[PDB]
Amino acid sequence: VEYDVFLSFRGPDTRKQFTDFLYHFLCYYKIHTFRDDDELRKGKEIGPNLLRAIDQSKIYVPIISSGYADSKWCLMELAEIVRRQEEDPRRIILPIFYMVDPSDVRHQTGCYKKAFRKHANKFDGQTIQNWKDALKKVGDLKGWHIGKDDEQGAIADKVSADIWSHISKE
Amino acid sequence: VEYDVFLSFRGPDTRKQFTDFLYHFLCYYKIHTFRDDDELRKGKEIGPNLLRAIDQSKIYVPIISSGYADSKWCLMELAEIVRRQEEDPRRIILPIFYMVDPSDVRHQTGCYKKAFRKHANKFDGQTIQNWKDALKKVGDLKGWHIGKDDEQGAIADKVSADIWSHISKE
Amino acid sequence: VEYDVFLSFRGPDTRKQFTDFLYHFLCYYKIHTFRDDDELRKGKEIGPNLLRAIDQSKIYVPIISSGYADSKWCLMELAEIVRRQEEDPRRIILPIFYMVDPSDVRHQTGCYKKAFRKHANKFDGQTIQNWKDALKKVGDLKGWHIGKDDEQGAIADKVSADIWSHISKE
Amino acid sequence: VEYDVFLSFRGPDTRKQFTDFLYHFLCYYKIHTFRDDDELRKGKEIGPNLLRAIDQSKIYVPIISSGYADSKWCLMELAEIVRRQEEDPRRIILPIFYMVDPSDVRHQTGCYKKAFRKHANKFDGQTIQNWKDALKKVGDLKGWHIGKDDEQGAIADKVSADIWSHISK
DNA sequence: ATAAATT
DNA sequence: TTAATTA
């Protein structure tokens, strides 16, 4: 039904780790959530599940990862994210970078170049800009930075209570 | 003053154990010779050295490897060779495959393709066919293939006196 | 929509403190300018962007910095600058020394000539005089010195005001 | 009377820990030698001193530095070394690499670019080839190859006893 | 007194 | 369903 938590993730690299450390912990504070695993590849956009999700979902939490440049499906997802955000700024974005530098989002260099260069031999000549623009417009909004060294856990604590706050009082 | 034996090489992966032996070993026979040498990179078609010696040659003996596709340069050198050979079939080739089998290296598959596709999308959208139809003609003429074990000494000898026969006595 | 204010500066030496800071302050004051960041290396100095702007340009503002010598394209940039200054002196130049001393740059002394000691056996042994004539020409026009103490605050504020006043009340 | 084992060295960059140490130890065997420090600088051709010693001595021992090529004065000296060598192979060589490996000397390549690269800017395109051709030929004969950690003192001994043997026998 | 391709 | 630097 109506819930306020839509997510995202990399594929094999971190989806399982995040489900183990954040998703449950969230469920322990009484908030219905959402996500899934399937890869389709029989087309590009699943209808009233992907779309019911983005539509009714409220405050997004896109855990960008150090591989978040390979999945065309993931690239088109965060897109519609930033799109249906820019309509009525009462729903808010909460980015949480991971391992990969927050210096590599305001211009896409470093670990992404081999990804895009081969990704650019394939798809459109235009829409790729409406993706690049969105991946631009996160590296400014606020951001828990969790490096590879700081305690990769109880930051879960610090990060849940907040998502509670923006709901309890309003 | 004019030599009688051309050559060709990849670069930083057989400028040591094999080739150099063959050069010195050959000089040890009074068969005045030539080879590739300069770390030049200069030009995309240099004339008054190669393009003098090539049509000054008499016997061709390239030495493929497992990365012989990377060449933006030696590749067309091989091309120039196989072409000009077609003019006067009074001079022959005698290539000796190296480490990689003479199968996956006659149809641009195996660990050889991904280098060619990197050097296929790069330039003249027609010339790639010219390079492939150049590499193809080689992998038929007989040749003392070398593997991991065949002692790198004996093969040198057996390639010597042979190279001699088609020069001294015909 | 035409571009009215030009710049030129060594790259990795004020890509992270001033040049940006200045451009941002400017665009928050209503003035359509242009700079860029493409290293080219596909010729000498192209047309459809730099030659477009410079000829259609107006108010010149370049910025010397302690790397302002190895500018194989950018020194040329200054050349074109000073020669497209040679037609109607109704467009001026307000260069601002930065960190580098004000008068040591009139003869390339101090820590400057060591660029030249090797920068004479590479490019043309004659046009160097037409480069040095220009790099001499700046050391004269009245404006703002900046050391390491005059903090990069106010300088922004004033260096805006002049540029605007040469547009509003003429 | 006359010198017996003529030396050479880098300029200042190794006038402490090694060279000297070697010189004293050598002299403690009773084998008359040479070494001088005079800087000339009154030109470039020094005559009746080493130019008498080079055609007067016997068995050599040129050492290389981390930057021997940069020194024009020592370079030209090793030149005449190899040249008064070439006329007869009765007198030997006996090099000793040091602060550089024979991985970058049979090539004048590697850290030598800083040297030759602007050592030539003034000098002709022929003499450079002559010198370089001389520096090449040391890269062959035998090498103690004193390295970064090997104790230098243990090699002074193992480099004296030899020169001794090549004098008694 | 200390940069180089697209080897 | 993988990749070069003379700002």
CA dihedral B5, B11, B15, B19 (to 10 degrees): -30
Q: How far is the CA of C51 from the C1' of F6 (A)?
A: 22
Query: What residues are paired with C60 via a beta bridge?
Result: C6, C93
Q: How far is the CA of D114 from the C1' of E2 (A)?
A: 7
Encoded amino acid at A107, one letter: H
Burial of C138 (0-12, 13-18, 19+ CB in 10 A): buried
Q: How far apart are the first and last CA of chain C?
A: 20
| DSSP three-state, residue B158 | helix
What residues of A are labeled active site? 77
d(CA B76, CA B44) in angstroms, rounded, equals 9
| DSSP three-state, residue A145 | strand
The DSSP output letter for B139 is G
The answer to whether the C-beta of C73 is closer than 7 A to strand F is yes
d(CA B29, CA B22) in angstroms, rounded, equals 12
Which two tokens mark B66? 């497992």
> What approach was used to elucidate this structure?
cryo-EM
| Nearest nucleotide (C1') to alpha carbon of B12 | E7
The answer to whether the C-beta of B52 is closer than 7 A to strand E is no
Q: Which residue segment(s) compose the domain that C43 sits in?
A: 1-170
Which two tokens mark B170? 């015909």
Q: Of the candidates C127, C125, C157, C134, which has an alpha carbon nearest to the alpha carbon of residue C144?
A: C157
Pick out residues 75-104 of chain C having their CB under 7 A from any atom of nucleic acid strand F. Answer: none
| Nearest nucleotide (C1') to alpha carbon of B114 | F2
In this structure, the number of other CB atoms found within 10 A of the CB of residue D61 comes to 19
| Nearest nucleotide (C1') to alpha carbon of C114 | E1
C44-60 in b/e form (b: 16+ CB < 10 A) is eeeeeebeebbeebebb
Q: How far is the CA of B34 from the C1' of E2 (A)?
A: 37
d(CA C52, CA C47) in angstroms, rounded, equals 6
Q: List bases, strand F, within 7 Å of protein CB.
A: 2-3, 5-7
Q: How far is the CA of D117 from the C1' of E3 (A)?
A: 13
The answer to whether the C-beta of C8 is closer than 7 A to strand F is no
Task: Find the angle CA(D82)-CA(D88)-CA(D94) to the nearest 5 degrees.
Answer: 50
Q: Exactly one of D77, D80, D87, D151 is catalytic; which is it?
A: D77
CA dihedral B28, B30, B36, B37 (to 10 degrees): 60
Going from the C-alpha of B133 to that of each of B78, B138, C26, C139, the distances in angstroms are 11, 10, 59, 63
Q: Count of domains in chain D?
A: 1
d(CA B60, CA D55) in angstroms, rounded, equals 50
| Nearest nucleotide (C1') to alpha carbon of D70 | E1
Q: How far is the CA of D57 from the C1' of E3 (A)?
A: 45
d(CA C158, CA C145) in angstroms, rounded, equals 13
Q: Exactly one of B77, B80, B86, B170 is catalytic; which is it?
A: B77
Element (H, E) at C56: helix C50-56
Per 3-state DSSP, what percentage of chain C is helix, strand, and coil (rounded to 5)?
Answer: 35, 5, 65
d(CA D121, CA B135) in angstroms, rounded, equals 45
Encoded amino acid at C118, one letter: K
The answer to whether the C-beta of C123 is closer than 7 A to strand F is no
| Nearest nucleotide (C1') to alpha carbon of C43 | F6
Q: How far is the CA of B132 from the C1' of E7 (A)?
A: 23
d(CA A116, CA A67) in angstroms, rounded, equals 11
Break sites following residues in chain B (C–N > 2.5 A): none
The answer to whether the C-beta of B118 is closer than 7 A to strand F is yes
In this structure, the number of other CB atoms found within 10 A of the CB of residue A104 comes to 15
Q: How far is the CA of C39 from the C1' of F6 (A)?
A: 10
Question: Among positive and negative, which fits the CA dihedral D69, D70, D72, D77?
Answer: negative
The answer to whether the C-beta of B29 is closer than 7 A to strand E is no
Break sites following residues in chain A (C–N > 2.5 A): none
Burial of C119 (0-12, 13-18, 19+ CB in 10 A): middle
The answer to whether the C-beta of B47 is closer than 7 A to strand E is no
Task: Find the angle CA(B8)-CA(B12)-CA(B17) to the nearest 5 degrees.
Answer: 80
**With contact defined as beta carbons under 8 Å apart, do B18 and B156 qualify?**
no
d(CA D97, CA D64) in angstroms, rounded, equals 6
d(CA C139, CA B170) in angstroms, rounded, equals 78
Q: Of the candidates D5, D117, D98, D15, which has an alpha carbon nearest to the alpha carbon of residue D54?
A: D5
d(CA A106, CA A140) in angstroms, rounded, equals 8
d(CA D8, CA D31) in angstroms, rounded, equals 17
d(CA A148, CA D53) in angstroms, rounded, equals 68
Residue closest to F7 C1′ by Cα = C11
d(CA B120, CA B132) in angstroms, rounded, equals 10
Which two tokens mark C139? 């050391």
The answer to whether the C-beta of B72 is closer than 7 A to strand F is no
Q: List bases, strand E, within 7 Å of protein CB.
A: 1-7
The answer to whether the C-beta of B38 is closer than 7 A to strand E is no
**With contact defined as beta carbons under 8 Å apart, do C105 and C139 qualify?**
yes
